[PDB]
Amino acid sequence: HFRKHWQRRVRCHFDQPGKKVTRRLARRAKAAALAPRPVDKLRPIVRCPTVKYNRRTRLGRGFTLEELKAAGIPRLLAPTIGIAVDHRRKNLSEESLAANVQRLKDYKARLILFPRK
Amino acid sequence: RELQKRKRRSSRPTIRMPNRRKKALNPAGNNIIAKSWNKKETLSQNYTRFGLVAKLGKATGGTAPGNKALLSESDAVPQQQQQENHIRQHDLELESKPEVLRALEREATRPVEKTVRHQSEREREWLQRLVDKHGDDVAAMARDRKLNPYQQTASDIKRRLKKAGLL
Amino acid sequence: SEKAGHQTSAESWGTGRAVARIPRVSGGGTHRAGQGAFGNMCRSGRMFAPTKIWRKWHVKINQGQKRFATASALAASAVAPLLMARGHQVSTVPEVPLVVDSAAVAGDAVAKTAAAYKLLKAIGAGPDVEKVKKSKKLRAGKGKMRGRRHRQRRGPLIVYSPEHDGKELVKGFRNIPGVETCPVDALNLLQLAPGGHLGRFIVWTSAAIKQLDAVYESKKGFFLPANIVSQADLSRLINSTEIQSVLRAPKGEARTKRAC
Amino acid sequence: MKVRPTVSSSRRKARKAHFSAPSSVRRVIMSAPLSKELREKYNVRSIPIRKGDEVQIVRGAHKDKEGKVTSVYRLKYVIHVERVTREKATGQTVPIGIHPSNVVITKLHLDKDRENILARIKAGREQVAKAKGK
RNA sequence: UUGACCUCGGAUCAGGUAGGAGGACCCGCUGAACUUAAGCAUAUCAAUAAGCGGAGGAAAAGAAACCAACAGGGAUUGCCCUAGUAACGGCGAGUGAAGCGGCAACAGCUCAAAUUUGAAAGCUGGCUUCGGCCCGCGUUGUAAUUUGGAGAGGAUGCUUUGGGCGAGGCUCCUUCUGAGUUCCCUGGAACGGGACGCCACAGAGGGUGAGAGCCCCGUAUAGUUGGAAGCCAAGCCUGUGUAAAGCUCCUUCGACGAGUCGAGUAGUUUGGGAAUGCUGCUCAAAAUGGGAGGUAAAUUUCUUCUAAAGCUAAAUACCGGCCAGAGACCGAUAGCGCACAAGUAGAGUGAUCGAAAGAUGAAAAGCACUUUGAAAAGAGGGUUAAAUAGCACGUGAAAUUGUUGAAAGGGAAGCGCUUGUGACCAGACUUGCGCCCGGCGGAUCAUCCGGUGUUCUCACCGGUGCACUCCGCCGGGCUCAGGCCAG
RNA sequence: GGGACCGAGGACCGCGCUCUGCAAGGAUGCUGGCGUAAUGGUCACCAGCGACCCGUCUUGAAACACGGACCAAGGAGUCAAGGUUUUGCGCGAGUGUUUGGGUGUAAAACCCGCACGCGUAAUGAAAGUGAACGUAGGUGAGAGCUUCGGCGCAUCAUCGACCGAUCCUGAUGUAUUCGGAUGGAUUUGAGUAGGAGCGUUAAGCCUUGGACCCGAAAGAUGGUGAAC
RNA sequence: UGAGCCCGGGUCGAACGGCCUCUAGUGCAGAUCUUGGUGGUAGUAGCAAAU
RNA sequence: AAACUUUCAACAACGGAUCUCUUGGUUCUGGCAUCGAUGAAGAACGCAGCGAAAUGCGAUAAGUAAUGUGAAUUGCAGAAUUCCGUGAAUCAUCGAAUCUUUGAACGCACAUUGCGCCCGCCGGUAUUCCGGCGGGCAUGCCUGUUCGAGCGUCAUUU
């Protein structure tokens, strides 16, 4: 497929170790500001969509508003304690709800919360 | 190119920019993490020694060995098996290990000052005028226009009187 | 540079004149005017097949082959005459793997280079250290203008266990010319076989040897390979009682007499 | 071995920086050893050369010759000390240039600044010697 | 006659703003042809180059009128595969995505549609002691509340607060922080060779009269002196108003974007005439509405979102800008056109075109002086380690040229085999062992003694002596051995 | 009997003979000469004999034709992507760490959690179906082994066996209009009949890029002057 | 055998060579080749232009 | 026999190859975001003892202020210039100034160091004349201020 000017639009990747150390220093600087805090946020267990990937789960975007309520975690406090919220996703089944509520109670057991000021 | 050739010929200093970054690479202060942070170690072995978790996602590669930094019933309801219409909204009621972890639970569960809120001088004067006229009958204070112009419900005044101390 | 040799306005003079059909520089008011351009045979011209950055510099090697070659370089270090055939002054050490006790290396006992030098002189690595020092020569060629001024030899290789010995002995051995330090978890074929030549003189630590069985049992997708021969001594194979009992009589001698 | 990223082990940049240095940087480059008596008196290894320092030459064809520094030619990285002169064709004696690395300082020209220089050196030499010791 | 309000203007009135540069990367507009198909026009090139407009350190996109058909997923962006698949085509040349999945990074929000109506609560000015006065904007709507996986209003009972200092800390410049100029030789000069040392969280690099860890600058780690601006911050003064806020409940409500969508047509573009998107033109909507899908499954059953308003960091790009660090790169006909007066000299009316050119020596010590004569020149004489290194300057090839020497030359030279003459130059086997006798000295010789290291039976020292043995040495005698060419 | 050229090999071994050793599987013996030069080298020249100026191109060939004043330096099958063959190597029904993460003495080296690529069962346009009746079969060859009786690798020939599809025959039965069982075919498969692949290194070839190097007239975009 | 290689004599002044591997901008008589330098023509033509 | 011609050698020329060197280029990687009506990028005229080149600077002109260092600059002519010091320097830093003509180029013209208006000052016979100097005077647009026009349009006998 060398029909166009391939020479003027060729990208080389000699900075692949250079981008790697820059990426690690970004994670390093993120935990410098958020020192006791983790570097990421809680994501729910989500089932992959198509019939090819029905039998494998993955990490989704955020928790359902019903999933926060069943676990006893308030919705306007959840982003402040490191839990991602997604209002677009719905449960549609008790198995998706029960798996993610159990995940939120496990996060609740492992959590150390500090009192304001 | 014509820029750089001019500087070589010129008797003007090359302005050497110091290595300043936007984001600091290390924590700072007089907190527990800042005192126990090792500059030479990386994030994962720092949080290993602290006893904490850095990443809550799925492990994206092989980790170093020993890091521990990357993580009857009638109605068939699965929620009932997981149990222990409003909840508390500004805090969460919560029920051989590393020293930094032991410290972090200590300032977590240390006693905190209440810092109570008082009523204003006009508010206690408004209630003091009300109790002297009617008394302990909170119903009549709700339906009296001249000393309750804001027309507040008797249960609200009862709750407000309890804060003042008057019955 | 991509623009090199062709940032010039030139056109061929055609068949009007008796000159070579090359692009010649237009204009008429300078020394440059009329000279050939754009040819690899032409002065101040573009070179034939210009070098580009998208040449393949790095090559992909299988991890199974890399772990094979490292395990072969480990085994060659335990073989005594391969050490002195590589160039190492191995004539004073009393054992070829030559493990040193961890108590003499670990902690801050070696973090000063005077104690690092003393430890190497005592165990037999003294001639190898002085061999690198006494071989410092200026580089033959044009690499001395490119940042490669001198060439010396390779001394012993320190191999330790960072979990047990600590990482304070890297500072002790850093400034002695020739000696190199490597953890037992991250062994390097570029250090184990310098130049492709096997038999690097390695000083071990007692903690590094117990770990060495563990690290090769923990590499996934790799087992220690089985040799295609069981006994690598040919003279035991051929001059054995089993083979020589069933052999024929010799048909001749090593020297064959001239009949006519 | 260098470890810091802000230092360059480049022959091109180093010879550029040496031969294009300004006069303040050229002062530190033209530093001279102190004599053994002067080392044991002020605990100082080496200081830059002034215009009034009695000096002794230890390298070159003018070895074992003592004199007072007459000028510090910072442009050609060389100093002129007293009575080491070479005759031209006309007989005019021109001073012979000696590098400050080829000499040793016998007497200093002291003022307030030079005492402050030598006190700052003996501050750091003792501070780390105490730190290395205890 | 007076005085509005509305609209349109003036002012060298006050306060501001835009132009141009740069354009490597970014957002738009506009838009070729060469080429390929061994000819060539569809196509391709290419939604490229050139042309125009417009930003920033990034830009752009972005919180679904999304993808899906699943047990569903869930703003945007970039990498890997998907995949040279689907799809389109003088079905030739070719063109050519996406959903899913694995990662990187993740963050959400503001309006319009409501009556604050028990009080325009909002905001620009310019006058000030600055503490608060007027003028104007604005009801054709400035604040608060609210933005449809919502929300409002009552009730309800728990749970939340706000400012001002601020020690100190982090980032970045800064000052200081190790050890030979010890002895000998060569050399103009030791930075070389030999001997003896020393430092090393420093043996990177560079300079110094030749290869310097210890002569000098620096180099390594931890501190330490002073300074700049951001951000964080232990604490300490404070608050307050029947002020704000989160939820819960319900015999009360819940407003969601038009010349837009869409139908027809022309153009352009795309893998994509369910028109793939976009633009112009004609016609022009709806409210249990509208958009996009799935499905032969018996009628359009069901699934999934809500267009015509708006903001938003990071992961991404970068031949430019302020620097910095590197290289299995080139080494002065090379590497950028330019190592140096280089976009300079110079040419062209002009747009534009555009070179050649590095090296004395460690140090000018750059030849004083005498003496020819008119010179970018000699002869003496001097400097230097060296001037056949004299600003024609390190080394100084070949072509080409002069002088000196040798030989030859009757209308070609040069070349192959083989002598011969002359000239110059080289130099052939390194040129030795074994016996005998006499003397002298040693030992690996004495069942001699003491010691050291060791592979534990081998070595090495010291002191004994010459009965024996064996080495040398000196003075004799003797033997054979040899390189090449001949007869 | 006279003359010429030659002396290869290096303990013994063999065939023999005239047998106290010989001429018998390759030269020894004796004597002499050689260092102010034995013997060589290079140059110049003389002499006898020999002997067209190289490259390219055309042609059956010569002959034309093109290039060559001379010297120094430069100077022309390269690098990417995708195919393909073979050699080596690693693992092997699997293989491939290197998008990324962890890590580091920091662009090196070392480690890997999930997917993904290619392969590990085929055929038919399609609905879709789907590898054993015989030690996965018999017979004959066949390397190798052998208790000498016989076992028999790979591979081939033939007779078979099964399956996908096509053309047939049409069982219990079945919703009364659905099915393919059994028995056949001078059928087809890039089928089964017991896996060989994946990654990499070296060389070669093919395609596309400037594509071994140098060499038109044209066309197009944007400017500068003013005209044959 | 050869491409080539080693030594002597002179000059010269600061770095270079052998082995085994890796790598490539790696070997010239031609291209009316490129750049530079230099010849015969020729002390000839002729004193035109340029200097 | 010389001359001439050819070959070879020694010495002397021409030329700049080879070897060595490199304050240059080329390629990669990393930290950061900073031009202009408060006049930019570019063009020009000037400023030094000898300044030819280059660089720096703007009539405060190879530069002034401030800070730091601590005794030069240098090819030749300097000073009674400064050395236990608020202090040399062709030094570094850099927070304060100065900044000619042009140029988006801005009162008009431009190829002239010319031609106008408003405000103020100075000198030379000077309230009248002349010359010089200082601050101003572009266009589009926004907010406000102020002035004006329009039977557009309202009210006006209590």
Helix content of chain B: 25-40%
Strand sequence of the main sheet of chain A, in spatial order?
Answer: 1-2
The portion of residues assigned to helices of chain A is: 25-40%
Distance between the termini of chain B: 87 Å
Strand tally of chain B, please? 0
* Secondary-structure class of chain B: mainly alpha
Largest sheet of chain A: 2 strands, antiparallel
- What is the alpha-carbon Rg of chain B in Å? 32 Å
Per DSSP, the total helix count of chain A is 3
Looking at the chains present, what oligomeric state does this protein adopt?
part of a larger assembly
Profile the largest sheet of chain B. Answer: none
Task: Please trace the helix and strand order of chain A, writing H or E for each element.
Answer: HEEHH
Q: How many strand elements of chain A? A: 2
Strand content of chain A is 5-15%
Query: Which shape of chain B, going by the Cα principal axes?
Result: extended
State the largest interface: A-B, 44 and 38 residues
How is the secondary structure organized here?
This is part of a larger assembly, with chains A (about 120 residues), B (about 170 residues), C (about 260 residues) and D (about 130 residues).
Chain A: H1 16-33, E1 45-47, E2 57-59, H2 65-70, H3 94-109
Antiparallel strand pairs in A: 1-2
Chain B: H1 2-9, H2 32-36, H3 43-50, H4 78-82, H5 99-108, H6 121-133, H7 138-142, H8 154-164
Chain C: E1 10-12, E2 23-25, H1 63-77, H2 80-86, E3 99-100, H3 113-123, H4 126-133, E4 137-138, E5 150-151, E6 157-160, H5 169-172, E7 180-183, H6 189-192, E8 202-205, H7 206-217, H8 234-238, H9 241-245
The structure holds 4 RNA strands.
